[PDB]
Design a protein around this ligand. Structure first.
Ligand SMILES: O=C1NC=C[C@@H](O)N1
Ligand SMILES: O=C1NC=C[C@@H](O)N1
Ligand SMILES: [Ca+2]
Ligand SMILES: [Ca+2]
Ligand SMILES: [Zn+2]
Ligand SMILES: [Zn+2]
Lengths: 156, 161
């Protein structure tokens, strides 16, 4: 990219936001994601945080997105972008790193940012922060109303 | 990582923790899965918060590595509950599982072996302030070597290659 946005990035972030809004409406943490094949723009999967929905300690948005893509040949991930409405925690960062997903496009990092955002860069990934106000507003709403649930979701 | 890293001390619960992790790995192996198991133990009293094994083949899962399945099986917990625990894993954690340990602040990780696999995560745990102990458990090494030998492409899939 050279820092150029991808032709698929608007689509990816819109899907991630749709997933965040759906999870909000389900009574969960409003964090959504999607994984797009950069070669053809195909959406390999989409998901949102399922902590409340499933009683899940590991289904963050990014993890649920990856789960929803199913088992894949490792090479597939090497030319994908993971879209996440919120800057990834250390766990989801680790997932991106493990699979070698080269680009992580982040809705916002104002309500939350871990050391993972920079660690992705150290590990050779491209991180794009869009500063999407849709994402920021829904996440801020959740934190305002359910702070202890939010803290649980990031292990505090 | 740092030149000044050092392996952590043993805990009175390590035999218990690695034996549970290994039993989980062997159960997963019998189920047709990747033989990697784990458990999470409270360092103060030895209680087992949860245990699990890799569920990639059992569940068609791209995220349920042994360590992730272990954490899932522990359920939702207050953040504080993790902060004096050990995660036992039969295999040195990949970057994903490392990240889970870091995110929850699980301060100690005991690793069955890192001969068959080792990621940057083992050292990154230490960089980030976590204790790591590698016990070089022969049972763990044997079962993982067998899996990699017999099903190499399935193993590569499990580590994203
Ligand atoms: O679902 C999520 N919770 C917290 C942070 C981010 O990784 N995603
Ligand atoms: O289940 C696992 N697969 C690979 C590595 C380790 O993190 N665990
Ligand atoms: Ca609390
Ligand atoms: Ca110490
Ligand atoms: Zn996360
Ligand atoms: Zn792993």
């Amino acid at each position: 990219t050279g820092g150029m946005a991808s032709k698929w990035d608007q689509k990816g972030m819109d899907i991630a936001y749709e997933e965040a809004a759906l999870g909000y409406k389900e009574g969960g943490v409003p964090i959504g994601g999607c994984l797009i094949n950069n070669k053809d723009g195909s959406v390999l999967g989409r998901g949102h945080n399922m902590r409340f929905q499933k009683g899940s300690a590991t289904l963050h948005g990014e993890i649920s997105t990856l789960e929803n893509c199913g088992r894949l040949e490792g090479k597939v991930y090497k030319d994908t972008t993971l879209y996440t409405t919120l800057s990834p925690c250390d766990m989801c960062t680790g997932a991106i790193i493990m699979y070698g997903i080269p680009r992580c496009v982040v809705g916002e990092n104002v309500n939350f940012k871990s050391k993972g955002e920079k660690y992705l860069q150290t590990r050779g990934h491209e991180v794009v922060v869009v500063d999407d106000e849709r994402c920021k507003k829904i996440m801020k709403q959740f934190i305002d109303e359910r702070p202890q649930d939010w803290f649980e979701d990031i292990g505090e």
